[PDB]
Amino acid sequence: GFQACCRGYLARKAFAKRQQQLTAMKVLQRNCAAYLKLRNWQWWRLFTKVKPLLQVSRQEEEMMAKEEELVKVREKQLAAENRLTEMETLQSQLMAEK
């Protein structure tokens, strides 16, 4: 009687994974469907060469990322010095102990 619930739980869980997986494959094949006719578009390959020249990202994402990354790297760099100072004391303490 309990094995039925365990077997059904797997079928229901596996069915849920297939439901979301089926919808995910739709976006994959759909994105690839239009890409076929779009791949051979003379206006696409020509325009893609201009996108690197525009760079719509600008400092809106670079400044925010660099500013947020600098804080994380700053604390990480300072954190390394903290661990280094702690290890220096242990290394120096062990030297005096040894």
């Binding site: 309990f2 059904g8 069915f15």
Partner: protein, 150 residues
Amino acid sequence: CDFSEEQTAEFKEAFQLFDRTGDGKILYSQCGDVMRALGQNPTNAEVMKVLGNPKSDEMNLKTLKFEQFLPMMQTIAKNKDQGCFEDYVEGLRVFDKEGNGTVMGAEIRHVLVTLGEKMTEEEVEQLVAGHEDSNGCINYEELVRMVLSG
């Protein structure tokens, strides 16, 4: 049929998700998967009974439709031999030695593989997965509570 059309529409939509069957059909072996995914908790014996006691080779050389699958689910929902979780939580206590609401995972795996209708090693592992602890024990109460919500 004693079944509303509201839930029947959702049942048809769920059954149409398989697709991989040539057309609006369903295989004998895959019938249990679709019968257990929509709801209910039929057993292997119940599945073989409602299916008319199919032969060993008949489980891979024939396919059914939805007109025959609907009455199967109807009978499984109406006529059933399952039970509430109060009896399941109390059944797993037979293996509890100390009696602190915990049981070894290996014992549960062995009981599921041997005792009962038997289960493959690929399913028992996924069932016992997630409830790993330091002492290797799995609380049967939490296991049953999680299986009931599935």
